[PDB]
Design a protein around this ligand. Sequence first.
Ligand code: LPP
Ligand code: LPP
Ligand code: LPP
Lengths: 240, 238, 238
Amino acid sequence: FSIERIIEAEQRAETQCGDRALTFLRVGPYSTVQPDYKGAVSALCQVVNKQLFQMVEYARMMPHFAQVPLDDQVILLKAAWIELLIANVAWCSIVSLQPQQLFLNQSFSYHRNSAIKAGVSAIFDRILSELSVKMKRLNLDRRELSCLKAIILYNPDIRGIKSRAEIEMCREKVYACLDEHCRLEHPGDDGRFAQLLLRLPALRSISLKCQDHLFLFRITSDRPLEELFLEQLEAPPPPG
Amino acid sequence: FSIERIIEAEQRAETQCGDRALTFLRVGPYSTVQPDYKGAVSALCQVVNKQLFQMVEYARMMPHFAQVPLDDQVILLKAAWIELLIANVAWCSIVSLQQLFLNQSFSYHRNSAIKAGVSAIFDRILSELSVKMKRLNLDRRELSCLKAIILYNPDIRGIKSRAEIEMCREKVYACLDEHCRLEHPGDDGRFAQLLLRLPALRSISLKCQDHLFLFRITSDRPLEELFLEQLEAPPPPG
Amino acid sequence: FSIERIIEAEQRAETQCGDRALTFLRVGPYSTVQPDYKGAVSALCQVVNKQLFQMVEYARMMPHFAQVPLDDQVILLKAAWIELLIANVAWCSIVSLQQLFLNQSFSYHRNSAIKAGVSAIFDRILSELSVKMKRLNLDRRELSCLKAIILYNPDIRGIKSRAEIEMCREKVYACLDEHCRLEHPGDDGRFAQLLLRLPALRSISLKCQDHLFLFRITSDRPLEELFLEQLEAPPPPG
Ligand SMILES: CCCCCCCCCCCCCCCC(=O)OC[C@H](COP(=O)(O)O)OC(=O)CCCCCCCCCCCCCCC
Ligand SMILES: CCCCCCCCCCCCCCCC(=O)OC[C@H](COP(=O)(O)O)OC(=O)CCCCCCCCCCCCCCC
Ligand SMILES: CCCCCCCCCCCCCCCC(=O)OC[C@H](COP(=O)(O)O)OC(=O)CCCCCCCCCCCCCCC
């Protein structure tokens, strides 16, 4: 249970899944998307569906995750998926830093004119101003982002969860890891640890608006995400 | 901490205590019992008092139970005893499937409960527990898990080591779920369904307790003391 | 994580820090203190500032204390310090059973407290803590357990690692229970009685705080900072 073990999970999940994807997003005949922009939106859907698949395998390799009861595993993923994805876009969008580019990967990105065009420039802006900019301003490193993402995953306050204690414990061990990293690498500002945590509330708020947009444009599967997560979990991992 | 380490505790407690008994149930002079049946009721008392003694030795062997302060060990037993006993009878009565078993031999017929007024309890034990357990194909490992979950209860007033107790319960959850994923690849809803029996066990168990303080067949000494005394004492064989 | 481990921390922190101090108490220019009584009060300040330094090193050595985030470490020390100091004076003063001891040799007579206007605190420390501890035959090892229970407080606002801290407190409970029923038999109610001293300690401790602020003999710098700075620095030889 170390930052290194958490890093390994992220990295391996990102390279061993190939093109496998959890198809939750997709444009159907009831989507509020103009016909001329279906190709574009569906491309965005394929990207997210692949990151979702990877996310599941990521959690599968996270310390203790596979041990909590399956029902708990499903709830944890349902509660943190959007925040985990947005944290990754915030980090990839640090390369080209009012910001004009939002990266989902290293080779797939949007300019602000397209957001404005799609009518989602407000969420485009706060992602870059409230997360990317402040992370850069803080000199956030890859190790600190991994810690923040784990803190998110290990959430014991979700309704319905069985193993709250076990989950809170994992979270606290990540706190300890994060603080040590702070102590070791940034002994000069004792306020760093707290500042890094301040990004979490902004991540949650932005993440909630994203979900609202998803429901509004109706590009989600009729099948409940819970089922999709449960099915991948009950299945073996890909060749990796 | 494994379904098998919990199984070992139950099994050993059931065979190594002999006829040793924790005397809580008793038929005395002030007891509201039909002298025409005092013998019968006192026989029921002896059975329960032996299962109570066994229960204490069971808990003594459960992972970490003997580590929390003694006051907490006493509170845990006082809160779970009836539910633990009734879980064992519900499991046994599955065999009959109007007969309720307390042992793998000692039983009681419907017509026996209608007499003492406890026909309601009799009915729901078989109705909500035995039948549904059978219907679910409940196995011994799962009953052991349900009973452990009951024992490790952190929400009781007065408890000191809540975190440890909860941590214990959660490890049993992890064991129960695994058992499911392995011996029931299918139905992902099994785990939760099994847990649904707990509320129905608690409710029935509370009724049984109200029907005890109503027959005056309990000791003048508070059960807490009896538990404390057996705990502060050594075990029977090993 | 046993009593021997907790005792070692206290003892070593008490002898390896030499004359170092964390200057939280000072007779500043804004102290409502009368000029004539400055040397005496400042002497009291130096004593407390040395015990504060030692306290930090004590915590730094306590099981798991150092791995939780600094911020939590800071909050724990800020909430516990006064109670930890007063627990030590209660124990010391036991010898005079008149006099209130801060050390095995630093002490005050009721008259001193009389003219300083703090005879109220003076009396309940000896009365509610020292006397009752003596009356209970409280031993050093046990005083260590009570002090750990105090340190490991998970209910403070702002704390991050509540679970881990609670787990630490509960392990001390088990230690205290084990010790208590082994060296002070003849009373299963001892454990609960020993814990009753905590609320008294907290109440008295809150009043002591009130006197500090009223008089204004505290540093212009927030104690949080002073704790954070000693924690972030290396320990003395130890
Ligand atoms: C992985 C995290 C992704 C976060 C990215 C958010 C920034 C938004 C990106 C801009 C999208 C441009 C699409 C191009 C189509 C276009 O120009 O579209 C242009 C058209 C304009 O048509 P009109 O001008 O005629 O009304 O708009 C549409 O038809 C609506 C497009 C649907 C918008 C879907 C976008 C999803 C909403 C984002 C929040 C959900 C996050 C899900 C991840 C958890
Ligand atoms: C192991 C848990 C036990 C769960 C209870 C299931 C057993 C129910 C069967 C009834 C018991 C037969 C007693 C004989 C009565 C009889 O024929 O005797 C018949 C008479 C009825 O009187 P009448 O002759 O006037 O109709 O009953 C009596 O003598 C009155 C005494 C009451 C009997 C005591 C019953 C105990 C209550 C059970 C609750 C125990 C739960 C607490 C432990 C967890
Ligand atoms: C280590 C904990 C110590 C707690 C023991 C309390 C006993 C206090 C003994 C009195 C000290 C006598 C000094 C002689 C000077 C004098 O007569 O003092 C005389 C003057 C009175 O002035 P006047 O006579 O002009 O009204 O008093 C003062 O100057 C104000 C008193 C300041 C002393 C503060 C101590 C109060 C206790 C607060 C608790 C702080 C501990 C917190 C850490 C846990």
